[PDB]
Design a protein around this nucleic acid. Structure first.
Ligand SMILES: [Zn+2]
Ligand SMILES: [Zn+2]
Ligand SMILES: [Zn+2]
Ligand SMILES: [Zn+2]
Lengths: 724, 1284
RNA sequence: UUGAUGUCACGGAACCUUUGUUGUCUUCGACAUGGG
């Protein structure tokens, strides 16, 4: 193919015409590029006809390229992998020439675009921005500044320079120098060459209030592919003109049409629009924040009735904080707070790990990993569940819903919220909204946690100090006007509050009269309110004990009316949960995976069993089974990093199989008192009361000398779930 | 009033230093400045100039001392001299004025509140913090530490070298960001000096706590420490001018690399190879008629370069200069480095971090482990120097050229192996409070020592290439190179763990056990076998620092950190490592490889071929092994090449949705190759080491020569000797080694299948090792595998065979020749070709086994019909009697040859057989003349009865006058030479010239030699003819391979032999003059009508009988010994050989005409070996069997299909030439072998009638009748035309 | 040439990806020379 083209350009060419010269030069370049790339074209084995004439004209040509590489990557009817390859070829072919003593502008300008567009395509790798991307943007700026040094108002170099500078601002870098000067020249250039420019004229408007450009933005034609972005820009233009009814109309129209992928810059720009309206102290931000939250509820169900998965977005937490602050109804505040809970957020690294495991199990959830479409959403440049009523709570209970508002905290306010629901009161008096500051409670938690990790039971004094901070942060837990005297409490925590023994909060009182919360109220926990689905207990006599724990012999559990397996393997675990036992005990170790919760695993005798494995077991029959867990539930949870972290664990896996209620420890439990505690609950299967009886029995021993070491052993146990 | 304490820091490792920053940027917002606070600083002597010196701040030393004091207080339960300390105070208002804030948890030893912030009686720890006392007055003051005497240096690069430090992703195995620091070597700059000054009110208990904290402080600036109270430039431009003046700058790159190879020793300059015949006329070193050889040998004798360190430096600089010149001789189309290898990322500390307090407790122990790390393979710690650019990849060395094993790399591999033990990755975030996971807490206790070797010889260079899968050749511009450190180097190893458990943690016990077992994979380039160590001679001890008596002994001796203390400690380390409790098997399995080759082997090394004294044009790779101070060479097969062979064996037999894996780009790719062999986006899961030969073989030289298809003589090509390792059926080469495969791969049956199939095809002989498989090298006889638990080898069972049908009878020939006993014939005739040559523009690609095409093996027997000579040209003085001792004075002599033998086994090379069969196949298909001296210029004598054209003709006339072996238009003499206007290529039809030929038009094509489209002027417009499609070209690999032939019977010799007791050697026959062919005879004159006649073939006849009687064929007088005659050892008729041909992706008509060219017909024969015109060399070939590959697992007998293939071949010839097929019957008539009573004479005429006693015409008379110029071509192109 | 009641930088493997490959019978008979 290419050799025949060269032959044609020699049959018809004289070099007193530059079109002949150019068309010849182009053919030689495309020949020699794919000679390097080792395509199938390397099998073309022929040569040129008319040897003496061809030698003459070639030698004349060499005695007397940016134009090509400009044309490539104009075609974009191809995937993100294919875009990435062509951009990299453009870089590695042109990088060699752009560093010449005085390179051409179009060589520099083409290479700058390739660096900018290639920068957009980098896949994140952690909580930080990838370093390759920031370097790519700075490379794009560097070549533009060669062109702008020789010509201060080259429009295309100016626009590439500004596009890269805005991305640096998106990455969390500071603006380059002369940003205002370059943006002023754009305001002198004075026209929208592409819709991607309008955000620059809005930046200019916000920095200088020179409203002249706003008429163009509103006047722009609607027959565009990414209209949802255009309405947001019209909404911003319409705000600066003070036309607030149309700001509302355009704003809602934008959200209603919003893209399904958080990688699209629209979602970041929308949050900044809300936050800008707020800091200007408009009232429009409240409505727009609530509407945006309602749209962001997009997710995947995994197997397991109650467990959800989502893709990571860096500013989602900020939006939910804003929507929570916008909403005034406490019942509606709860639904915003409840929407965060019992949901994992993963990156496109770990989403591929699940895709592999789904493939290994030949499961059609593999197709739900079309979510990796998010990788093809990075570029705007191209221009390309039932709600459980709260009325289902039985009237003899109290329910406490927590939310931790980080934005409200970092602005210096009391960002902790406890939304308390009483089903017995008149319809306007059922909900209370009590707020507290959790900064010192969080610090004392981290202080215990490190002492626990290094010393286990040596941390008992820090645990005791922590339990007093729960009361100090939340005095309302001990007021009868907020939690009436006798009624059981249901906890629905948030963030690091999942780690705390809320049921064991301590009031100091008089020095001889310390008082503990469990002496007043019984307690149960739920990861989230939407897991509420009561059912009766399993109608069987079978009790089963699965052990792989060689350190200890549970003499009180093992010598009884139990189906005991001293060692065990994942096949036996799978088999036992297909028999719907009345009680199932599972006593073994486990290990966490900090990066991917689903790959946390239980230690059985010859083969580890992951949470992913446990969720996906077929033919499970476990509805209404009562379950008791050993060290695995405590050990499969990582050390906390952020206050609003929530981590999946084996208790949540069993609850996804509709288990009745689950007993587990908040930290590693002493085997000798697991032996006693679980024996008592097995003998007297009303867990809610019998656990309180056990705790109020042992608290008499604690009161004798106030041994923190004893409190450390009886505090960890809690009940999860809500049966009929 | 105050008092002063002198202080000095002694460094035990290279310490780190940060870049200089302008005074405005020295603030908390500058990430590069904040990240460098833990390092040493550079002081610019004056702002605008780099001249300066290093220093260390006292603020840094105080911070380390405070950390030490906390640790000593927690051990002593908060009491110093039986006086008590409160926790101290670590919180301020106005945090913004602090440059840094504490991320780590402060330790506690008591629960009491700290002292009031305006009190008088502060406790000792508060005196050390300076809260005691609190224009500004200091209670204890730390000064800066500086080099003794404050010397100055012109910049940081005079003091140290800046080095890139990695961060590798555990899941991918690739680094996504990095940072830089200056490393300053402690041997050059061991000590810094400073002072501490103390106010007189400071208590005695505070003074004790200070001194103990100084002795307990063991690190600063990233290094372990103890605190105590021109010719190369001239020679380059000279050589460059010489190489330019002689117009041979195409060799600049090769000269640059070859001269840089001389770093190893100056003694190599005296050994540089010479020309053939032993003269100083070698094509590189004797450029310049002074020669480069003289320039180097005079540089070698120069006293300024007699020091080995200075010779090394001279060679390095000269190589760099020649390399930096060499690039301009080419278009320079690409940058070879790849994209955005520039991502410098500095960790950012969190200002907002929460304060915490932790107890840790009094139990604290320190375990010391001492040993050695021994390199079991070559290793690569990558450190590029941007001031050196000849090598693409470079290895880390100390400033005095000793090899270094960095601290930073040892920690990085410990952290990797600990995450492997726990089987749980860490998200290795930078900044914020310390990570509390189980791996990070171990690494926070560990300490290791930077180490260096004593060995310091220069690194080896290993060159690497990429193969174009479609053509089977190297890809355009793909050559690149790498430095590596030798195997066998020994490093000191020392590790210390400080923690609360007794002894090491169980995870660390296990990881050290993996290292002791030989799985310390520590360096880069692991996928090609680099960087495997064993920890050896391990010893260990535990110190109980919780004990007050041991703690004070520890403090007294600075923990035995320095070399004096360490020798005292090594007297009381216990032998051996502690056994782990929860042992876990390592992540890699060793698979052991055994390969058998019954053929020669070569794995080429062009730079060695240039430097080595042996002088042959291709030589094998050899690798150097360090033992003590010496380096000793070994022949090996490279890990890179072996990886390439196995990778392509997997690739060619798998697909990704109908596209072969050889055709993909493998970027952002997740196919089978990327999952096993890795990608630019992730590390591979299989590691290949070098293979080595047991029994230590020695190379042997084989010479080769190309034969002009017209004249039948040598074609004066560039010399192409090779020096392979010798192997034969009686003496196979045994290759042994190992490759390491990851545990999760052996556990996957889908990968075991992929490898099993590929290794099955290697075992089947489809993938030869090394170069020159076309002529029978590198033939694998078997591949054996152990250590897989038969998970791979279960697929490698032999294919055996399907059927036992016998090969058909070859047809009887219909050729006829009417010999007449009274007449005399000419020894050779020419086959005149057909006008049409069938060419194709795009051949069959090599990247897969194509459907509808055949792959398999042919096995053959060859039988001598007439005595055969195949000389062993390694020794041309074979038959001189032993008693004529050592007659050698560069006299010239009667040469004498034995028959070709290899390991004393009589054989025929495959290069001979390929060329013999190629010539017939070229003729049967009417191909081009594959070998032909198309740029030769003819001349004739004048009969007795300016433009550059006239100059080139005249200088042709001048050389032919000068170089005449028979001596005792512009013309210098009245009757003289006539020189042709045209090259001999112009006397041949343009379609019969080579498809890939030489330039034969007007004008010098060298004007374009920098530009790639030059190659299109040298290629035919229509592509490749049939022979070039089958046997290949220099731009396209061929599809047939010819093996060596082995004699079956015990030899039958022509002459009975000098020792009756030995049947394995024959006697000599003496031959007549073998003489040059003469194209001036068959192209009689300058006239344009005299075109090239055709392809020469020698006829079959029995003149060899006259020669064994000792008589000359033409005139029956005795043959006489002279330096122009030869004597040889010849086999008789009736000897039988066997050999095998492999073929791949042939069409049925191609295999049909190949078998036809081998087999011929009953009544026809081939010519092989020396002295064809004298009767010798007639052989016949019979096909014994054909075996075909159906797939990787099934092979089948093809004997029943030979009749079909032959038919389709003849059908193809009818399709091309439509019964205009005379050139075949002329060929068969020259392949005819005389029968029974027939006995053609056959011989050349004598130069004159009267010179012949038989009275036949002779040349002088023959030119005047029946061979006049007008008749001569018709005579010579008619087979068996008599001349008398 | 530091600034002090706060420095886990021994907080970070220069890491990952590329067959020195391809093409060539150690072969062999007609002259040489300038005059006249
Ligand atoms: Zn104090
Ligand atoms: Zn970690
Ligand atoms: Zn691939
Ligand atoms: Zn050809």
């Amino acid at each position: 193919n290419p050799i025949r083209d060269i032959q044609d350009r020699l049959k018809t060419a004289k070099f007193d015409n530059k079109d002949d010269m150019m068309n010849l030069a182009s053919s030689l370049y495309k020949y020699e590029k794919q000679l390097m790339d080792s395509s199938e074209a390397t099998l073309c084995q022929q040569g040129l006809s008319n040897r003496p004439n061809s030698f003459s004209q070639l030698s004349q040509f060499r005695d007397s390229k940016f134009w090509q590489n400009e044309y490539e990557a104009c075609k974009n009817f191809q995937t993100h992998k294919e875009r990435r390859e062509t951009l990299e070829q453009i870089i590695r072919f042109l990088q060699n020439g752009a560093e010449e003593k005085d390179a051409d502008d179009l060589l520099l300008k083409t290479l700058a675009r390739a660096y900018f567009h290639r920068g957009l395509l980098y896949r994140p790798k952690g909580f930080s921005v990838p370093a390759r991307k920031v370097e790519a943007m700075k490379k794009a700026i560097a070549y533009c500044e060669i062109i702008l040094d020789k010509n201060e108002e080259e429009s295309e170099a100016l626009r590439i320079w500004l596009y890269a500078a805005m991305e640096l601002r998106r990455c969390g870098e500071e603006y380059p120098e002369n940003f205002a000067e370059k943006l002023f020249y754009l305001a002198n250039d004075g026209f929208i060459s592409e819709l991607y420019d309008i955000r620059l004229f809005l930046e200019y408007t916000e920095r200088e209030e020179d409203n002249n450009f706003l008429d163009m933005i509103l006047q722009e034609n609607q027959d565009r592919e990414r209209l949802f972005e255009l309405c947001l820009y019209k909404a911003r233009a319409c705000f600066h003109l003070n036309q607030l009814n149309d700001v509302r109309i355009y704003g809602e129209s934008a959200i209603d049409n919003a893209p399904g992928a958080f990688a699209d810059p629209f979602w970041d720009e929308l949050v900044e629009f809300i936050r800008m309206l707020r800091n200007k102290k408009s009232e429009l931000w409240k409505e727009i924040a609530i509407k945006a939250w309602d749209k962001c509820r997009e997710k995947e169900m995994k197997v397991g009735n109650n467990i959800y998965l989502s893709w990571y977005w860096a500013r989602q937490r900020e939006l939910y904080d804003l929507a929570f602050m916008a909403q005034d109804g406490i019942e509606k505040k709860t639904r915003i707070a409840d929407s965060l809970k019992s949901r994992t957020t993963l990156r496109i690294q770990e989403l591929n790990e699940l895709r592999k495991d789904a493939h290994r199990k030949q499961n059609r959830r593999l197709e739900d990993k079309l979510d990796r479409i998010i990788e093809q959403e990075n570029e705007a440049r191209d221009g390309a569940r039932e709600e459980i009523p709260f009325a289902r709570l039985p009237q003899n209970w109290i329910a406490v819903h927590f939310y931790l508002n980080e934005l409200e905290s970092h602005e210096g306010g009391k960002g902790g919220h406890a939304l308390i629901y009483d089903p017995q009161k008149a319809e306007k008096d059922q909900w209370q909204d009590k707020s507290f500051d959790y900064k010192e409670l969080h610090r004392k938690f981290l202080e215990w946690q490190e002492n626990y990790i290094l010393n286990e039971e040596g941390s008992a004094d820090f645990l005791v100090t922590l339990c007093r901070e729960i009361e100090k942060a939340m005095p309302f837990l001990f007021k009868s006007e907020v939690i009436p005297e006798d009624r059981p409490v249901l906890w629905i925590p948030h963030g690091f509050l999942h780690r705390l023994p809320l049921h064991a909060a301590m009031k100091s009182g008089n020095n001889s009269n310390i008082e503990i919360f469990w002496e007043r109220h019984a307690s149960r926990y739920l990861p989230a309110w939407h897991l509420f689905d009561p059912a009766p207990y399993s109608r069987e006599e079978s009790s089963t004990l699965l052990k792989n724990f060689e350190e200890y012999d549970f003499q009180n559990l093992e010598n009884g009316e139990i189906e005991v397996y001293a060692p065990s393997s994942p096949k036996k675990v799978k088999e036992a949960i297909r028999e719907n036992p009345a009680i199932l005990l599972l006593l073994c170790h486990g290990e966490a995976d900090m990066t991917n919760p689903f790959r946390s695993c239980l230690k059985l005798k010859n083969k580890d069993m992951t949470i992913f494995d446990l969720l996906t077991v077929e033919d499970v029959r476990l509805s209404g089974s009562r379950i008791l867990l050993g060290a695995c539930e405590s050990d499969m949870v990582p050390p906390l990093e952020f206050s609003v972290d929530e981590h999946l664990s084996v208790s949540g896996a069993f609850l996804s199989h509709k288990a009745g209620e689950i007993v587990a420890g908040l930290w590693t439990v002493d085997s000798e008192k697991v032996d006693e505690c679980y024996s008592y609950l097995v003998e007297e299967k009303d867990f809610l009361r019998n656990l309180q009886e056990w705790q109020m029995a042992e608290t008499e021993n604690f009161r004798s000398e106030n041994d923190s070491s004893l409190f450390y052993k009886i505090a960890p146990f809690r009940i999860i779930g809500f049966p009929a | 009033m105050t008092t002063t304490m002198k202080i000095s820091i002694e460094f035990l490792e290279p310490f780190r230093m940060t870049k200089w920053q302008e005074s405005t940027r020295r603030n908390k917002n500058n990430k590069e400045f904040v990240r460098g606070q833990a390092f040493a600083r550079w002081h610019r002597n004056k702002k605008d100039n780099t001249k300066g010196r290093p220093y260390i701040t006292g603020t840094l030393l105080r911070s380390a001392v405070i950390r030490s004091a906390e640790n000593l207080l927690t051990l002593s339960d908060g009491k110093i001299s039986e006086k008590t300390c409160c926790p101290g105070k670590f919180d301020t208002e106005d945090k913004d004025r602090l440059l840094q804030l504490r991320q780590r948890s402060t330790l506690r030893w008591t629960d009491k509140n700290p002292c009031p912030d305006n009190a008088e009686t502060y406790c000792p720890f508060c005196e050390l913090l300076g809260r005691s006392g609190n224009d500004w007055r200091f209670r204890i003051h730390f000064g800066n530490l500086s080099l003794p005497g404050k010397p100055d240096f012109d910049g940081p690069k005079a003091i140290g070298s800046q080095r890139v430090l990695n961060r590798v992703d555990f899941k991918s195995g690739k680094a996504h960001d990095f940072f830089k620091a200056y490393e300053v070597d402690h041997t050059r700059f061991p000590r810094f000096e400073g002072e501490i000054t103390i106010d007189n009110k400071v208590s005695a208990e505070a003074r004790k706590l200070l001194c103990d904290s100084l002795k307990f402080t063991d690190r600063l600036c990233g290094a372990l420490c103890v605190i105590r109270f021109n010719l190369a430039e001239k020679t380059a431009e000279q050589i460059i001018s010489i190489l330019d003046d002689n117009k041979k700058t195409e060799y600049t790159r090769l000269l640059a690399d070859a001269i840089r190879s001389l770093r190893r020793s100056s003694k190599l300059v005296a050994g540089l190879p010479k020309d053939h015949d032993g003269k100083d006329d070698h094509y590189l070193w004797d450029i310049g008629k002074v020669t480069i050889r003289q320039i180097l040998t005079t540089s070698a004798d120069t006293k300024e370069l007699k020091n080995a360190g200075k010779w090394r430096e001279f060679c390095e600089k000269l190589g760099e200069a020649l390399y930096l010149k060499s690039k301009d001789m080419s278009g320079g189309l690409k940058i070879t480095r790849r994209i955005l290898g520039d991502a410098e990322f500095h960790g950012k500390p969190d200002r907002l971090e929460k304060s915490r307090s932790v107890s840790i407790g009094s139990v604290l122990k320190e375990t010391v482990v001492c040993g050695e790390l021994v390199a079991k393979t070559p290793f690569f710690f990558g450190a590029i120097d941007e001031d050196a650019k000849q090598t693409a990849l470079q290895v880390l060395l100390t400033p005095d050229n000793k090899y270094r094993l960095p601290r930073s790399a040892v920690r990085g591999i410990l952290r990797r192996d600990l995450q492997t033990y726990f089987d749980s990755p860490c998200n290795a975030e930078l900044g914020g409070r310390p990570c509390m996971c189980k791996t990070c807490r171990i690494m926070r206790g560990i300490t290791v020592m930077d180490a260096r070797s004593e060995y310091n010889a220069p690194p080896e260079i290993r060159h690497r290439t990429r193969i174009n899968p479609f053509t089977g050749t190297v890809a355009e511009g793909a050559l690149f190179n790498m430095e590596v450190a030798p195997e066998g180097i020994v490093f000191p190893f020392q590790l210390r763990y400080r923690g609360s458990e007794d002894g090491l943690p169980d995870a660390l016990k296990t990881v050290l056990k993996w290292w002791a077992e030989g799985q310390a994979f520590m360096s880069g380039a692991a996928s090609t076998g680099k960087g495997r160590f064993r920890m050896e001679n391990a010893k260990y001890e535990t110190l109980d620092l919780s004990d007050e008596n041991q703690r004070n002994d520890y403090l007294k001796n600075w923990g035995w950190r320095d070399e004096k203390g360490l020798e005292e400690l090594k007297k009381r380390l216990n032998s051996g490592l502690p056994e782990p409790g929860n042992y876990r098997d390592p992540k890699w399995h060793e698979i052991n490889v055994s390969i058998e080759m019954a053929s020669p082997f070569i794995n080429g090394d062009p730079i060695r071929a240039a430097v080595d004294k042996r002088g042959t044009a291709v030589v094998t790779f050899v690798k150097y092994k360090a033992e003590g101070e010496e380096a000793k060479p070994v022949c090996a097969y490279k890990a890179e090449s072996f990886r390439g062979v196995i990778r392509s064996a997997v690739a060619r037999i798998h697909m990704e949705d109908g596209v072969p894996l050889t055709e993909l780009t493998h970027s952002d790719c997740e196919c089978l190759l990327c999952q096993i062999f890795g990608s630019e986006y992730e590390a591979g899961k299989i590691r290949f080491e070098d293979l080595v030969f047991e029994s230590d073989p020695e190379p042997v030289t084989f010479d080769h020569v190309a034969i002009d298809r017209f004249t039948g003589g040598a074609a004066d090509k560039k010399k192409f000797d090779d020096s392979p390792l010798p192997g034969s059926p009686a003496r196979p080469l045994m290759l042994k080694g190992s490759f390491w495969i990851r545990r999760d791969v052996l556990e996957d049956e889908e990968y075991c299948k992929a490898l099993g199939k590929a290794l099955a095809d290697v075992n089947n002989g489809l993938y030869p090792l090394g170069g020159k498989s076309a002529i029978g090298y590198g033939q694998v006889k078997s591949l054996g595998i152990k250590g897989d638990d038969k998970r791979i080898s279960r697929l490698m069972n032999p294919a055996f065979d399907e059927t036992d049908v016998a090969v058909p009878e070859k047809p009887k020939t219909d050729a006829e020749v009417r010999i007449e006993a009274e007449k005399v014939y000419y020894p050779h005739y020419f086959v005149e070709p057909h006008k049409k040559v069938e060419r194709e523009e795009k051949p069959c690609g090599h990247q897969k086994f194509h459907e509808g095409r055949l792959t398999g093996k042919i096995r053959c027997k060859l039988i001598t019909k007439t005595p055969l000579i195949v000389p062993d040209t390694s020794n041309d003085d074979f038959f001189r009697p032993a008693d004529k001792e050592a007659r050698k004075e560069k006299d010239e002599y009667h040469k004498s040859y034995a028959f070709f033998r290899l390991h004393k086994q009589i054989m025929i090379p495959g290069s001979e057989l390929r060329g013999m069969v190629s010539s017939v196949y070229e003729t049967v298909t009417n191909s081009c003349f594959r070998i032909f001296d198309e740029t030769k210029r003819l001349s004739w004598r004048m009969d007795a009865d300016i433009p550059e054209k006239a100059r080139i003709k005249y200088k042709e006339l001048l050389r032919v006058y000068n170089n005449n072996p028979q001596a005792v238009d512009i013309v210098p003499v009245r009757i003289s030479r006539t020189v042709d206007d045209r090259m001999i290529g112009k006397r041949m039809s343009a379609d019969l010239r080579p498809c890939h030929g030489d330039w034969v038009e007007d004008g010098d094509l060298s004007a374009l030699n920098a530009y790639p489209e030059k190659r299109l002027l040298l290629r035919h417009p229509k592509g490749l003819c049939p022979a070039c499609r089958l046997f290949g070209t220099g731009s396209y690999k061929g599809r047939v391979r010819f093996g060596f032939a082995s004699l079956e019977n015990d030899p039958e010799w022509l002459i009975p032999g000098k020792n009756p007791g030995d049947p394995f050697h024959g006697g000599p026959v003496m031959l007549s003059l073998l003489e040059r062919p003469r194209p001036t005879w068959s192209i009689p004159g300058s006239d344009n009508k005299f075109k090239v006649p055709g392809r020469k073939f020698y006829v079959h006849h029995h003149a060899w009988k006259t020669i064994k009687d000792g008589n000359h064929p033409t005139t029956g007088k005795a043959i006489e010994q002279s330096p122009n005659n030869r004597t040889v050892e010849a086999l008789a008729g009736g000897n039988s050989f066997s050999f095998e041909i492999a073929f791949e992706n042939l069409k049925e008509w191609e295999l049909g005409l190949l078998i036809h060219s081998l087999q011929l017909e009953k009544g026809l024969a081939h010519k092989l070996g020396m002295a064809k015109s004298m009767g010798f060399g007639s052989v016949e070939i019979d096909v014994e069997s054909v075996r075909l590959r159906k797939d990787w697992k099934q092979w089948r007998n093809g004997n029943s299909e030979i009749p079909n293939w032959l038919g389709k071949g003849f059908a193809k010839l009818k399709e091309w030439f439509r019964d205009e097929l005379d050139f075949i019957e002329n060929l068969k008539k020259l392949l005819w072998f005389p029968e029974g009573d027939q006995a053609p004479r056959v011989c050349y005429p004598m130069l004159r009638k009267k010179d012949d006693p038989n009275g036949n015409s002779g040349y002088e008379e023959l030119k005047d009748g029946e061979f006049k110029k007008e008749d001569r071509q018709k005579k010579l192109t008619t087979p068996w035309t008599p001349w008398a």
